[PDB]
Design a protein around this ligand. Structure first.
Ligand SMILES: CCCCCCCCCCC(CCCCCCCCCC)(CO[C@@H]1O[C@H](CO)[C@@H](O[C@H]2O[C@H](CO)[C@@H](O)[C@H](O)[C@H]2O)[C@H](O)[C@H]1O)CO[C@@H]1O[C@H](CO)[C@@H](O[C@H]2O[C@H](CO)[C@@H](O)[C@H](O)[C@H]2O)[C@H](O)[C@H]1O
Ligand SMILES: CCCCCCCCCCC(CCCCCCCCCC)(CO[C@@H]1O[C@H](CO)[C@@H](O[C@H]2O[C@H](CO)[C@@H](O)[C@H](O)[C@H]2O)[C@H](O)[C@H]1O)CO[C@@H]1O[C@H](CO)[C@@H](O[C@H]2O[C@H](CO)[C@@H](O)[C@H](O)[C@H]2O)[C@H](O)[C@H]1O
Ligand SMILES: CC(C)CCC[C@@H](C)[C@H]1CC[C@H]2[C@@H]3CC=C4C[C@@H](OC(=O)CCC(=O)O)CC[C@]4(C)[C@H]3CC[C@]12C
Ligand SMILES: CC(C)CCC[C@@H](C)[C@H]1CC[C@H]2[C@@H]3CC=C4C[C@@H](OC(=O)CCC(=O)O)CC[C@]4(C)[C@H]3CC[C@]12C
Ligand SMILES: CC(C)CCC[C@@H](C)[C@H]1CC[C@H]2[C@@H]3CC=C4C[C@@H](OC(=O)CCC(=O)O)CC[C@]4(C)[C@H]3CC[C@]12C
Ligand SMILES: CC(C)CCC[C@@H](C)[C@H]1CC[C@H]2[C@@H]3CC=C4C[C@@H](OC(=O)CCC(=O)O)CC[C@]4(C)[C@H]3CC[C@]12C
Ligand SMILES: CC(C)CCC[C@@H](C)[C@H]1CC[C@H]2[C@@H]3CC=C4C[C@@H](OC(=O)CCC(=O)O)CC[C@]4(C)[C@H]3CC[C@]12C
Ligand SMILES: CC(C)CCC[C@@H](C)[C@H]1CC[C@H]2[C@@H]3CC=C4C[C@@H](OC(=O)CCC(=O)O)CC[C@]4(C)[C@H]3CC[C@]12C
Ligand SMILES: CC(C)CCC[C@@H](C)[C@H]1CC[C@H]2[C@@H]3CC=C4C[C@@H](OC(=O)CCC(=O)O)CC[C@]4(C)[C@H]3CC[C@]12C
Ligand SMILES: CC(C)CCC[C@@H](C)[C@H]1CC[C@H]2[C@@H]3CC=C4C[C@@H](OC(=O)CCC(=O)O)CC[C@]4(C)[C@H]3CC[C@]12C
Ligand SMILES: CC(C)CCC[C@@H](C)[C@H]1CC[C@H]2[C@@H]3CC=C4C[C@@H](OC(=O)CCC(=O)O)CC[C@]4(C)[C@H]3CC[C@]12C
Ligand SMILES: CC(C)CCC[C@@H](C)[C@H]1CC[C@H]2[C@@H]3CC=C4C[C@@H](OC(=O)CCC(=O)O)CC[C@]4(C)[C@H]3CC[C@]12C
Ligand SMILES: CC(C)CCC[C@@H](C)[C@H]1CC[C@H]2[C@@H]3CC=C4C[C@@H](OC(=O)CCC(=O)O)CC[C@]4(C)[C@H]3CC[C@]12C
Ligand SMILES: CC(C)CCC[C@@H](C)[C@H]1CC[C@H]2[C@@H]3CC=C4C[C@@H](OC(=O)CCC(=O)O)CC[C@]4(C)[C@H]3CC[C@]12C
Ligand SMILES: CCCCCC(=O)OC[C@@H](COP(=O)(O)OCCN)OC(=O)CCCCC
Ligand SMILES: *[C@@H]1O[C@H](CO)[C@@H](O)[C@H](O)[C@H]1NC(C)=O
Ligand SMILES: *[C@@H]1O[C@H](CO)[C@@H](O)[C@H](O)[C@H]1NC(C)=O
Ligand SMILES: *[C@@H]1O[C@H](CO)[C@@H](O)[C@H](O)[C@H]1NC(C)=O
Ligand SMILES: [Ca+2]
Ligand SMILES: [Ca+2]
Ligand code: NA
Ligand code: NA
Lengths: 953, 151
């Protein structure tokens, strides 16, 4: 038995044991990580962008569990299906049992003067713009749009199988301006239209657009006009405007909203800025080959027109492909960080072994995350942790190598155990604090309600801590092996002439900068630096706290960007979807908020809040009762009180779904009985019906509706909900509000607080069968916005508390700790204020980067702060010169590696990669300047001397 | 003025699964499937069902099929007083049709007159396409076959 006396003696005597045990554990984590769990799925990027466990979120989960479980023989039904089956069997036995006594050519608009259908949001479509900035309303541009469709879409080998048809001989025509011109003037096709047809069509548009603007035109009257031989009179509009629905369809679908303004272009031809083409192929994953073959690598123009926007339904289908293809940019960042570190360390062995540890930290964390912590979900933004770890992982290797070189210089006679021990005393805590501040800022995001934010915090926080453990085990053992063996085991002719000389020139030029030049510039201009970095701090604080501010997300969740803004798919959702009338209508300009009230189901989420696929199961309330006379009386009174509130939209058209108990009372009052078959349901029954009469007659009334009327009940319709035995287990009421749907946070908060407080107060009066009712509406985006605001404040406050408390423990001096947080506050205001000026909003990844800015900013201030108190000089000027020379080079290298890793993400297609790269560049510039100039100027002017501000143990 | 169909005619003169007809088949529905919730039993008194299964499976159909079949029931009774629409297959759990069929997802129906008078069937198929079925086929002397798009 000869085990080493201490950890420093273990690294000194047995470094190959340490590398062997680390390598064994790393390959065991790697094998189990690829073999045991199901691999990550990125086929949906918006997966997990959901609040869980919130009040609104639990009611939205419950309402979706009700809609999933409503239908024929499901948990809930709109119809008493067992009674319907028994009633039908009773009629069969009465009659049927006796009464059933025994047992390609192109489309030609002169032949086929119609399109196969109207345009719609279900068809694949592209947006055109002018290549020369002209109006699109010219014959070359019209024919260019038809030529692009024929060349890029209809030519594709799969198009013949995808296209709509009336007959096997030909595909349907595309909805395009040239084809509407070819029916209005009766040409064969777009390819045979003429300048007089374009001009005549423009005259018809100018003439008729006033009826479109005034709502008098519409899509309707051509149906009857096509039947009649003589004339049309289903409208008061001039008959020329309705000739095929052409003017309505051109204006509502094919041209931008500003082509025919009510301020009419009477002076000169209107500027058609954008036009849309619809292909007779349905949107979705069937469009993938047409896009990838004919549109992906194309430069989107023929020199007459340009394809500026595309809507094929494949944005999220391409996302997993581009997400994985763009992993080439982190790989180039690894190569550049290796190059920087090899020149800095003067060792390819220490450099390659350090990068092995960085990549291994992400492997080991994936094993811990899926196999030990048992996360069933891996967000796509967990792949961004590679960029973070490549940039920042290096930043302990530079420090430990400097401290090792200082230790070898200070004590040349020392044993390897002494050199390791002294190096670990000087490095290990500082390396921990810069690491732990950044892990804690990631882990602080585990307080978020949003599943994907919590998951990314745990994965990235864990890789940062696993990397630290390797920097104090693997890296010291690697440094000892380099010293023992590879300081012997060292185009060949020019290596002394060029390489070694250039390395020496770089070394001494850099060293003279950090020893002489940088301390001179910091100290000589300290009054300029104090004024400048204070003025930037106030400017950044005004931009984030006063005017403007960082705004909450402005698009709705299904429109969330996932690619660079220049991508046609993104340009469609963010620029063109607001400019065409059929898309404006779909976002709900006129839409009132529904007030939905549910009884008989419990508002809860029993799924795993960390798995976005686990939404639990539907929980019925066993204490519910609608059929009691007291419940019948109170629920009628509730509908009538709600309709007297200022939040209720009292339209003249009655809706007999909205309060089903009133419609049922009115139906009972119609039963003019003269036979026993109606007996319990007769109109002489007074309203609080005996419970058996209610439970019977509600089934008779619901089936009488279904037989009498061409109207159907579906999983969203208000009314009772029956189980498999036809007992009522839930009730849904719905009313329209005076509030409109909006993406604005304070307006939607006003609706929710006004309605939920009134309903909650009123429900306290309810009989015991109705006291547990709950209100729901279209509130998912408001709950996301609410959760983004809340989670950012808590995660950032937790990060600031960690940053200050470790500062005090790192440097046992209140004054140094206070100058460090003043430098860090300035860093954060200038960093976040710059992201506000760059146009960032508090969305999912942007929210996380705000708390991560705190943990990163700590690094350079702690390094310069422990070097200030380590300094042997009695005077604060000598203490600053010592701090700058002793840490300047390693801090510069930690910053440069992180900036370089961010800069490499700029060519990426994927938005999360470019945004994180922008953040990594910007936070390193601001953090390096606020630590090197501003914090060191505070120390030079009024840094402590002797025991001043020192904290006792 | 309306014209009866010929013995093997189908009115969208293209295969049933084409986008301009009843569109793509999604997959077989069985009583244990979650898509079974989306079938609806028809109880219209204007229609006669010949469910040889005695399971009631012929009443089970999707909402668009139920809408179109109820318009056809009105149309048949309006065309011939005292004649009803008849169904011999709705959704089929027998597997008696094909290896692939719109009967297996409740989007197709096999039909006759109440009276089984085969001379009316070409006019019944005409009434089907007026009632608004998305594909209609004079499939055999025993019945017309009608089907619908997915909702
Ligand atoms: C554990 C790690 C998990 C990491 C996370 C998951 C990784 C998922 C990787 C996905 C992925 C990228 C590989 C990136 C490598 C860097 C990874 C760094 C990781 C650091 C931790 C795998 O890429 C695959 O890489 C294989 C080699 O690795 C290669 O093999 C081949 O060579 C073997 C040897 O000669 C040989 O034997 C074998 O026969 C060969 O077939 C495959 O053909 C190739 O498809 C998919 O992208 C592929 O590469 C490009 C990407 O932008 C993309 O380029 C296109 O666009 C460029 C621009 O417009 C343009 O310029 C290019 O011309 C154009 O082509 C490709 O179209 C795409 O297909
Ligand atoms: C889960 C419930 C879901 C209900 C869904 C209803 C669907 C619609 C059909 C409702 C219905 C038939 C159903 C009858 C059985 C109902 C049993 C229900 C039992 C369970 C609750 C109710 O017809 C009933 O008729 C009764 C007799 O006349 C009458 O009673 C009275 O009689 C006595 C004093 O004379 C006394 O006894 C009693 O007090 C009295 O009031 C009732 O008030 C009335 O509700 C017909 O109502 C008509 O529906 C039309 C649209 O189809 C609707 O059209 C308009 O709006 C459309 C847009 O909406 C729009 O497009 C149209 O252009 C537009 O023109 C009409 O405006 C509406 O009138
Ligand atoms: C690569 C991963 C997947 C597995 C790692 C497990 C083993 C291959 C490791 C674990 C401990 C290591 C051993 C730790 C200690 C020693 C003693 C050491 O003895 C000496 O006196 C040095 C001799 C010299 O090389 O000059 C020689 C290497 C050896 C056997 C090491 C070789 C590699 C070992 C067996
Ligand atoms: C377009 C992209 C792909 C170009 C990337 C080029 C970089 C990899 C080059 C450009 C300048 C180089 C730097 C020039 C000078 C130095 C100082 C040098 O300092 C020392 O060796 C230590 C001095 C001391 O003892 O303090 C460390 C490497 C570094 C940052 C070099 C690393 C490699 C750099 C960043
Ligand atoms: C970036 C990471 C993922 C690379 C890790 C690759 C591994 C397969 C390991 C196994 C053995 C290692 C090698 C062991 C010995 C040497 C000799 C060594 O030779 C020198 O000239 C050293 C000069 C110096 O650094 O001082 C250079 C590194 C290298 C190839 C090592 C680099 C990393 C290797 C190839
Ligand atoms: C090396 C460090 C940075 C990560 C350590 C964990 C890895 C072992 C995991 C993380 C992401 C995983 C990848 C995520 C996605 C894919 C795409 C997958 O191919 C697909 O087209 C199918 C994806 C799908 O299921 O939809 C092949 C495996 C791969 C590379 C996975 C292999 C295992 C990976 C690299
Ligand atoms: C995931 C788990 C397994 C990580 C475990 C990490 C520890 C094994 C490492 C982290 C930092 C290390 C310490 C870093 C610095 C030092 C100072 C060094 O010098 C002294 O303590 C001088 C005075 C004395 O020897 O008593 C001795 C080793 C020690 C305690 C190290 C012991 C081993 C530590 C605690
Ligand atoms: C421009 C700001 C917003 C970015 C933050 C970094 C600055 C603090 C750096 C960038 C370029 C630097 C300047 C570049 C060169 C010089 C020449 C230098 O000339 C000398 O005579 C002293 C040189 C020496 O000591 O030998 C005086 C400082 C100055 C103006 C530097 C001051 C510090 C500057 C403004
Ligand atoms: C962004 C928020 C968090 C800042 C809130 C606190 C600051 C307003 C305080 C903290 C430290 C203070 C500074 C500490 C040291 C100095 C150096 C001092 O320099 C001199 O007096 C130079 C002449 C001399 O040597 O006597 C001038 C004031 C100043 C900038 C102080 C101004 C007020 C500061 C910036
Ligand atoms: C304490 C020092 C070290 C750093 C500065 C911390 C905070 C003063 C800042 C940084 C980012 C800010 C957040 C950025 C974005 C928003 C969204 C904003 O959303 C709104 O509802 C605004 C009004 C509206 O949209 O109607 C609410 C404040 C909040 C959380 C901000 C609150 C104040 C924060 C946390
Ligand atoms: C020395 C440290 C503290 C700062 C790092 C270097 C500076 C040169 C950086 C820091 C922040 C940067 C700014 C951050 C944000 C913007 C907004 C950006 O967009 C707009 O002005 C238009 C959009 C909008 O204002 O809404 C143009 C570049 C600019 C001024 C950047 C220019 C370069 C700046 C001043
Ligand atoms: C915002 C973040 C990303 C900043 C990152 C740190 C940089 C500011 C550092 C990294 C390497 C440094 C360079 C390393 C070597 C030199 C040579 C040096 O040469 C001399 O002073 C000549 C002395 C002589 O030999 O006479 C001048 C500064 C410079 C360019 C350094 C300037 C500061 C640099 C660019
Ligand atoms: C950062 C904000 C939000 C909270 C802290 C507010 C105050 C408690 C700070 C602001 C400026 C600080 C002062 C800035 C400069 C100095 C000079 C310094 O002067 C000495 O004589 C040092 C020792 C010596 O040289 O003898 C002693 C600390 C003191 C009073 C600092 C004590 C703590 C102060 C008053
Ligand atoms: C107000 C409360 C809630 C703050 C609690 C947390 C910290 C900010 C406290 C805990 C202990 C405190 C320290 C306890 C003792 C001292 C020594 C005291 O005297 C000296 O520094 C002068 C010594 C000399 O004669 O040289 C000045 C305040 C200071 C640093 C205190 C500053 C504030 C500290 C760090
Ligand atoms: C400074 C540490 C702060 C950590 C805060 C945090 O996010 O904790 C999340 C937990 C995982 O919690 P779970 O409930 O998912 O764990 C389930 C385990 N069967 O994971 C951890 O606590 C991991 C700690 C160990 C990392 C090496
Ligand atoms: C265009 O339509 C008219 C009827 O309006 C028809 O007579 C004429 O033949 C058509 N043009 C051509 C070239 O056939
Ligand atoms: C696209 O390529 C074509 C053919 O070279 C060219 O006419 C057109 O000007 C190009 N447009 C752009 C925007 O690159
Ligand atoms: C209620 O329906 C279930 C099947 O969903 C059945 O097991 C139970 O027996 C029924 N209740 C009664 C009282 O029969
Ligand atoms: Ca049957
Ligand atoms: Ca059958
Ligand atoms: Na770095
Ligand atoms: Na940090």
């Amino acid at each position: 038995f000869k085990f080493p006396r201490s950890y420093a003696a273990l690294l000194a005597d047995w470094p190959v044991v340490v590398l062997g045990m680390c390598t064994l554990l790393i390959v065991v984590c790697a094998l189990v990580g690829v073999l045991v769990p199901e691999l990550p799925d990125f086929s949906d990027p918006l997966l997990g962008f959901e609040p869980r466990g919130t009040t609104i979120g639990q009611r939205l989960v419950t309402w979706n569990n009700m809609m999933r479980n409503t239908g024929y023989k499901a948990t809930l039904a709109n119809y008493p299906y067992k009674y319907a089956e028994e009633q039908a069997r009773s009629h069969r036995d009465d009659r049927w049992s006796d009464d059933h006594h025994e047992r390609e050519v192109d489309w030609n608009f002169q032949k086929d003067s119609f399109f196969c259908d109207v345009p719609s949001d279900g068809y694949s479509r592209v947006v055109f713009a002018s290549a020369g900035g002209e109006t699109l309303w010219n014959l070359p541009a019209i024919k260019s749009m038809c030529d692009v469709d024929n060349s890029r879409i209809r030519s594709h080998p799969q198009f013949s199988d995808l296209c709509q048809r009336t007959t096997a001989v030909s595909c349907c025509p595309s909805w395009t301006l040239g084809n509407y011109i070819a029916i209005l003037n009766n040409r064969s096709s777009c390819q045979k239209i003429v300048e007089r047809d374009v001009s005549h069509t423009l005259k018809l548009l100018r003439t008729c657009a006033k009826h479109y603007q005034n709502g008098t035109l519409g899509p309707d009257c051509w149906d009857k006009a096509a039947r009649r031989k003589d004339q049309l009179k289903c409208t008061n509009v001039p008959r020329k405007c309705t000739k095929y629905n052409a003017v309505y369809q051109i204006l509502h679908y094919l041209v931008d909203k500003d082509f025919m303004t009510p301020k009419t272009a009477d002076y000169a031809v209107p500027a058609l800025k954008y036009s849309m083409l619809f292909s007779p192929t349905e949107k979705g994953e069937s469009m993938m080959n047409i896009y990838l073959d004919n549109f992906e690598n194309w430069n989107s123009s023929d020199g007459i027109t340009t394809v500026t926007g595309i809507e094929f339904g494949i944005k999220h289908s391409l996302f997993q492909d581009y997400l994985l293809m763009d992993t080439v940019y982190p790989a180039i960042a690894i190569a550049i960080v290796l190059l920087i570190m090899c020149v800095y360390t003067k060792s390819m062995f220490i450099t390659l072994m350090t990068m092995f540890a960085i990549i291994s930290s992400l492997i080991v964390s994936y094993f811990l995350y899926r196999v030990v912590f048992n996360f069933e979900f891996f967000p796509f933004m967990n792949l961004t942790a590679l960029i973070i770890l490549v940039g920042i992982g290096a930043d302990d290797a530079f420090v430990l190598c400097d401290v090792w070189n200082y230790t070898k210089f200070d004590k040349p006679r020392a044993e390897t155990s002494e050199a390791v021990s002294v190096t670990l005393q000087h490095a290990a805590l500082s390396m921990f604090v810069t690491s732990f501040t950044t892990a804690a800022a990631f882990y602080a995001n585990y307080v978020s309600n949003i599943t994907a934010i919590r998951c990314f915090g745990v994965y990235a926080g864990t890789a940062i801590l696993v990397n630290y453990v390797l920097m104090v085990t693997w890296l010291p053992a690697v440094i000892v092996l380099h010293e023992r063996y590879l300081l012997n085991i060292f185009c060949w002719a020019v290596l002394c002439q060029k390489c070694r000389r250039v390395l020496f020139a770089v070394s001494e030029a850099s060293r003279i900068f950090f020893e002489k030049v940088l301390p001179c510039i910091v100290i000589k201009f300290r009054y300029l630096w104090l004024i400048w970095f204070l003025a930037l701090t106030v400017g950044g604080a005004y931009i984030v706290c006063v005017n403007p501010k960082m705004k909450l997300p402005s698009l709705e969740l299904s429109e969330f960007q996932v690619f660079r803004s220049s991508h046609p798919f993104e340009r469609y959702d963010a620029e063109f979807k607001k400019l065409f009338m059929f898309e404006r209508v779909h976002h709900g300009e006129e839409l009132h908020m529904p007030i939905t009230v549910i009884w008989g189901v419990s508002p809860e989420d029993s799924g795993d809040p960390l798995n976005p696929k686990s939404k639990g199961e539907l929980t019925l309330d066993s204490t519910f009762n609608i059929a009691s006379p007291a419940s019948q009386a109170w629920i009628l009174h509730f509908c009538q009180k709600l309709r007297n509130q200022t939040f209720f939209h009292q339209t003249e058209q009655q809706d007999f779904t909205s309060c089903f108990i009133e419609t049922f009372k009115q139906w009972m009052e119609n039963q003019d009985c003269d036979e026993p078959a109606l007996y319990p349901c007769c109109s002489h029954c007074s309203f609080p019906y005996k419970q058996e009469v209610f439970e019977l007659c509600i089934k008779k009334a619901i089936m009488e509706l279904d037989r009498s009327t061409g109207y159907h009940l579906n999983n969203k319709t208000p009314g009772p909900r029956f189980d498999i035995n036809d007992t009522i287990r839930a009730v849904v009421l719905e009313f329209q509000s005076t509030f409109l749907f909006t993406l604005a946070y304070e307006k939607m908060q006003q609706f929710y607080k006004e309605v939920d407080s009134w309903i909650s107060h009123e429900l306290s009066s309810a009989p015991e069968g109705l006291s547990r009712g709950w209100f729901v509406s279209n509130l998912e985006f408001y709950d996301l916005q609410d959760s983004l605001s809340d989670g950012t404040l808590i995660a950032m406050g937790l990060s600031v508390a960690v940053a200050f408390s470790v500062m005090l423990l790192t440097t046992w001096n209140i004054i140094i700790s206070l100058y460090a947080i003043v430098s860090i506050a300035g860093t954060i205001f200038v960093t976040v204020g710059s992201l506000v000026l760059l146009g960032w909003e508090l969305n999912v990844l942007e929210s996380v980067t705000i708390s991560v800015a705190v943990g990163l900013s700590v690094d350079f201030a702690v390094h310069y702060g422990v070097a200030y108190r380590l300094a042997p000089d009695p005077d604060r000027e000598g203490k600053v010169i010592f701090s700058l020379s002793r840490m300047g080079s390693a801090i510069a290298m930690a910053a440069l590696t992180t900036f370089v890793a961010g800069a490499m993400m700029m060519p990426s297609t994927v938005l999360a990669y470019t945004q994180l790269g922008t953040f990594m560049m910007l936070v390193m510039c601001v953090s390096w300047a606020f630590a090197t100039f501003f914090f060191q100027c505070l120390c030079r002017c009024l840094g402590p001397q002797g025991t001043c501000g020192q904290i006792p143990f | 003025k309306l014209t009866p169909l010929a013995y093997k005619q189908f009115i969208p003169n293209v295969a049933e699964k084409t986008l301009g007809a009843s569109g793509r088949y999604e997959g077989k529905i069985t009583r244990n499937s979650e898509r079974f919730k989306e079938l609806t039993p028809n109880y219209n008194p204007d229609i006669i069902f010949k469910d040889e299964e005695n399971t009631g499976a012929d009443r089970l159909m999707t909402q668009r099929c139920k809408d179109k079949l109820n318009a056809l029931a009105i149309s048949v009774m309006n065309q011939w007083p005292g004649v009803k629409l008849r169904v011999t297959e709705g959704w089929d759990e027998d597997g008696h049709h094909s290896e692939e069929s719109l009967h297996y997802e409740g989007r197709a129906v096999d039909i006759t007159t109440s009276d089984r008078d085969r001379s009316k069937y070409g006019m019944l198929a005409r009434l089907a396409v007026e009632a608004g079925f998305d594909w209609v086929y004079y499939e055999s002397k025993a019945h017309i076959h009608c089907s619908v798009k997915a909702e």
